[PDB]
Design a protein around this ligand. Structure first.
Ligand SMILES: Nc1ccn([C@@H]2O[C@@H]3COP(=O)(O)O[C@H]3[C@H]2O)c(=O)n1
Ligand SMILES: Nc1ccn([C@@H]2O[C@@H]3COP(=O)(O)O[C@H]3[C@H]2O)c(=O)n1
Ligand SMILES: Nc1ccn([C@@H]2O[C@@H]3COP(=O)(O)O[C@H]3[C@H]2O)c(=O)n1
Ligand SMILES: CC(C)=CCC/C(C)=C/COP(=O)(O)OP(=O)(O)O
Ligand SMILES: [Mg+2]
Ligand SMILES: [Zn+2]
Ligand SMILES: [Zn+2]
Ligand SMILES: [Zn+2]
Lengths: 162, 162, 162
């Protein structure tokens, strides 16, 4: 008995105050920062949700409530590793993941290798199983007007029974 | 010969008039309702499309035309079961599904268990094979301004030949 | 050793000037055209990214830079076949693809069969492995206001080792 499972995640955060932003674990210089209870790290959030979705464990909002102040300013990589620990406790292993950052700016391409390192590390997998890409929406929408950043992820999990 | 197949669906409806809304089959109280030829049930629509997409049967607009008044006010669960019947007639069985509601409001979390019951029932599967989650877009976009609700779904089908 | 891999792609282009638009390789009559370095063909772009994502080869922006004028006005089908050649050189074969055009107008349904022919041809597969669908966002958003067209795609690749 070998089971394969598909998952999908989507997240948005608004720009706010200032600092760098944090995306896929990488600190990226930018005129403004991300408003969140959190890292605001939309890439890891969308990814975490894709993983929980494939395991039918719900999503980050269920596992890590807005209400609990133990998650205020939390490293989104902590959340990813925690979510992943539980996924593994139900007997799943990683097939592969693919992430799509939707942002007008800043440039994501230079930071993609480092994101993959962080993600592969956090998921205890080889980098070959992690893909991250970016698209701009050509000045259209809330993304295109520089009001915020959106991100999607899909994930494939494997489970042996065997 | 064992074939696995991936599918994706996306849907949007605008808020309009009033009543509850219907999302994933669940009647959810809200100041306004959903404008549609239909349930307006964006969750089941996006899901139905994910399923038809994986089976290469097109989408709901092809199977259930806007033009046909036999679908006016139709229970979107009827459409889901009908779409699923045809999917099964081509020899597919369910692997798993994952759904992402994108809405500023109302709160989706309390209603998610009941949605999963409805979906699992409609697809003749165990609840373990159905995941539903929600994300807000933090007041950004048409979703964030409370103008409507969007939803995504991914699906994995299996086919034995064998 | 048999490996299955999931990928996701998303693209947007703004309407601009005039002419037909090109979507999934098909020339579709419309009051306005698509602004791009390219075909502007959002369907094939989102699809190309889904395929590269599953193979962990990045995305079109990495393979085919905005900076290189060898891609100005390029047939997006050339890019798809090139991206696919490289995917195959890493030893992958096609499982299936599913595409979702998000557009208020023009009507996509009549052109879907011809898109599938083009895609199946370009990917050297049977049409049964290619699905394309469309959704409108009911006048909501940049899509709903006729400012541009968005598209999503998911893809499943197979690799034998064996
Ligand atoms: N319309 C919505 C939108 C989001 N949600 C869930 O609320 C959680 C709040 O914290 P989170 O980390 O953003 O995850 C959110 C969704 O689970 C929800 O229940 N209904
Ligand atoms: N730009 C678009 C958008 C949507 N469509 C299809 O039209 C169908 C109308 O009813 P439906 O149930 O929304 O599904 C729609 C798409 O199939 C389309 O053909 N072109
Ligand atoms: N915020 C963004 C958005 C897009 N990108 C990448 O830039 C590339 C430009 O050409 P392309 O064909 O649109 O692909 C883009 C993304 O790879 C990026 O690096 N950062
Ligand atoms: C599943 C997904 C990704 C849904 C998109 C949700 C979002 C709020 C889009 C509307 O904003 P917009 O930027 O497209 O339009 P506008 O700027 O006019 O509000
Ligand atoms: Mg999407
Ligand atoms: Zn988030
Ligand atoms: Zn609908
Ligand atoms: Zn493009």
């Amino acid at each position: 008995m070998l089971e394969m499972r598909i998952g999908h995640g989507f997240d948005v955060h608004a720009f706010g105050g200032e600092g760098p932003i944090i995306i896929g674990g990488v600190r990226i210089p930018y005129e403004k920062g991300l408003l969140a209870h959190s890292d605001g790290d939309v890439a890891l959030h969308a990814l975490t949700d894709a993983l929980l979705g494939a395991a039918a464990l719900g999503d980050i909002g269920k596992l890590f409530p807005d209400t609990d102040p133990a998650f205020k300013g939390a490293d989104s990589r902590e959340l990813l590793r925690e979510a992943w620990r539980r996924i593994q406790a139900k007997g799943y292993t990683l097939g592969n993941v693919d992430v799509t950052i939707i942002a007008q700016a800043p440039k994501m391409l230079p930071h993609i290798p480092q994101m993959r390192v962080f993600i592969a590390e956090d998921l205890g997998c080889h980098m070959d199983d992690v893909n991250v890409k970016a698209t701009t929406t050509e000045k259209l929408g809330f993304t295109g007007r520089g009001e915020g950043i959106a991100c999607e992820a899909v994930a494939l999990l494997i489970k042996a029974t065997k």
